[PDB]
Each structure stands twice: as C-alpha cells, then as structure tokens.
Design an enzyme around this catalytic site. Structure first.
Site, PDB file in Angstrom:
ATOM      1  CB  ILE A  71      39.856  50.551  45.883  1.00  0.00           C
ATOM      2  CG1 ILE A  71      38.818  49.712  45.692  1.00  0.00           C
ATOM      3  CG2 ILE A  71      39.213  51.713  46.692  1.00  0.00           C
ATOM      4  CD1 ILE A  71      39.311  48.230  45.091  1.00  0.00           C
ATOM      5  CD  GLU A 160      42.652  40.588  43.562  1.00  0.00           C
ATOM      6  OE1 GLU A 160      42.065  40.309  42.316  1.00  0.00           O
ATOM      7  OE2 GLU A 160      43.651  41.059  43.832  1.00  0.00           O
ATOM      8  NE  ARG A 163      41.350  43.175  39.106  1.00  0.00           N
ATOM      9  CZ  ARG A 163      41.969  43.827  40.339  1.00  0.00           C
ATOM     10  NH1 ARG A 163      41.974  43.231  41.561  1.00  0.00           N
ATOM     11  NH2 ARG A 163      42.274  45.020  40.187  1.00  0.00           N
TER      12      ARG A 163
END
Ligand SMILES: *[C@@H]1O[C@H](CO)[C@@H](O)[C@H](O)[C@H]1NC(C)=O
Ligand SMILES: O=c1[nH]cc(F)c(=O)[nH]1
Length: 246
Positions: A71, A160, A163
């Site tokens: 970000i 996250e 991912r």
C-alpha cells in the site's frame, strides 16, 4: 479497479473481493502455477486503486503498487495520505492528484515502523472484517497513531490475504468476530519475500529450495519448507514477489 463493501459482507463476498484483487495484478509468466509479479511497471499503471466502503457507506480509495502489493497511500474525501518513504513519494505523482491537500504520515509502511507508531505489535491487534470496517472509519478522520494500527489491519486483511490463501481464510473465520492473527499468519507475512525467492530459484533446481524457509504451522509448531511440493507452495501462496525486487 477493485471494490469491497463491508455492509452486507460475508465470507463469500470477501473471498470474491480478494479474488478480484489477485486478478487485477498483472503478470506474464507463472512459476509452478503461481502468478509471478512483474519486476517493474512504469507510469500510473504501476498502481491499483481499491475502493473500500465501510458499513455506513463511507469510502477511502487505496493505492497499491502492483509489483509487490505494498500500500502506498490512500485518499479520504479530499485529503490524501502517503507513507514516508520514496516509493510512496513517487506514487503520489500518479494518484490522488486532484486531492485538495496531501498529507505524508510520520512513518514508512513497513511493519516494524507501523508497530512502533501504533505502540503495539500486530500480534496483539485483532484483525477481521469488523476490524477492517473500523480501520476504514479511522482513516477518514486523521490521527497518525490510530491510523498506524488501522493500516496494520488494512494491510493484512487486504495485501496479505491476496498473497496467502491461509490468511484469506483466517479473515473469513473472523468475519463477525475479530481475533489476533495466529503466529502462522505472522510467520507467512514475514516469509513472503523468502518464499517468493526460493520458489523462483527452484525453477532450475528441480523444485528444491536453495535455502529452506522456516515457518510456524497452525498447531504452533516450527516447520521447514524445502521443496515446491509443500502445501504452502501448492495450496497457500497465490502471488510471488519478483526476485528482481529482492
Ligand atoms: C519435500 O517436502 C515434503 C513435504 O513437506 C516432505 O515430505 C519431503 O520430505 C521433502 N522431500 C524432499 C526431497 O526434500
Ligand atoms: O513490511 C511490509 N510488508 C507488506 C506490506 F504490504 C507492507 O506495506 N510492508
């Protein structure tokens, strides 16, 4: 651009939003069937914008570097906020240009610095969808200390999750009740780079890691990852940081 609304959100739509987020990140080749993120991208195309609506309908738009999912900053009504680091600095040249005023936060975007500014490790910050709804609300009305903790939530329930499927599932379980992340979740967040690297170095090493990656499994046990057959690689990790950026 990918959107997600907390009002009426359930595990299903969150999953869909997270899927959308993965789909929005460009990649040319796949490594062992996992999308490989580009080494670099020039221009405004290097950034992905996420429209996030909290339960009451208020929104913030978050800018993400599509080459690493970091970000860079976000926009709240007419103010823009960017981390205090070069990458974000660059990023501010392409997004939220029309913002009536831009603020730079007193910290960079890495977990180490965010945990300091927030005054607590993310091990003790409950995450979940409810937590995400709060975070969104927090970022609308500036408070650098509060935002730090809000950003630690946003990064984990967003970047996250995209991912790692495990983390996406951790969030779906916390859809109506926040809960601190398991240390397995922390273990992964901290191993994304190492895993992205070793998975790529396996491509010419018969799927075997040059260096094994030590993690913590869901039972809380220390565990070694030596080869792509591991469930981490076959089932978990959904995106790979290009080794050019390591
Ligand atoms: C590879 O990893 C698998 C799954 O954890 C493990 O069972 C096996 O011992 C490893 N094999 C090799 C050749 O490294
Ligand atoms: O240390 C970090 N890991 C992952 C991120 F998305 C980030 O901003 N910082």
């Amino acid at each position: 651009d990918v959107s997600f609304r907390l009002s009426g959100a359930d595990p299903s739509s969150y999953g869909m939003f997270i899927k959308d987020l993965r789909n929005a990140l460009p990649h040319t080749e796949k490594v062992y069937n996992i999308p490989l993120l580009l080494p670099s991208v020039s221009g405004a195309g290097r950034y992905l914008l996420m429209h996030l609506f909290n339960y009451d309908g208020n929104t913030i738009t978050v800018a993400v570097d599509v080459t690493n999912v970091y970000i860079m900053g976000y926009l709240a009504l007419t103010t823009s906020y960017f981390f205090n680091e070069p990458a974000a600095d660059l990023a501010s040249q392409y997004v939220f240009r029309s913002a009536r005023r831009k603020i730079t936060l007193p910290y960079s975007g890495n977990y180490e610095r965010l945990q300091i500014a927030a005054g607590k490790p993310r091990e003790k910050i409950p995450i979940g969808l409810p937590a995400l709804d709060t975070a969104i609300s927090t970022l609308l009305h500036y408070d650098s200390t509060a935002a730090a903790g809000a950003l630690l939530v946003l990064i984990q329930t967003t970047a996250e999750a995209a991912r790692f499927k495990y983390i996406e599932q951790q969030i779906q379980e916390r859809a109506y009740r926040d809960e601190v992340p398991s240390s397995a979740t922390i273990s992964l967040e901290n191993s994304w780079s190492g895993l992205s690297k070793q998975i790529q170095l396996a491509q010419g090493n018969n799927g075997v890691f040059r260096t094994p990656t030590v993690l913590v499994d869901s039972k809380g046990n220390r565990v070694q990852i030596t080869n792509v057959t591991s469930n981490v690689v076959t089932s978990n990790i959904q995106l790979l940081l290009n080794t050019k950026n390591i």
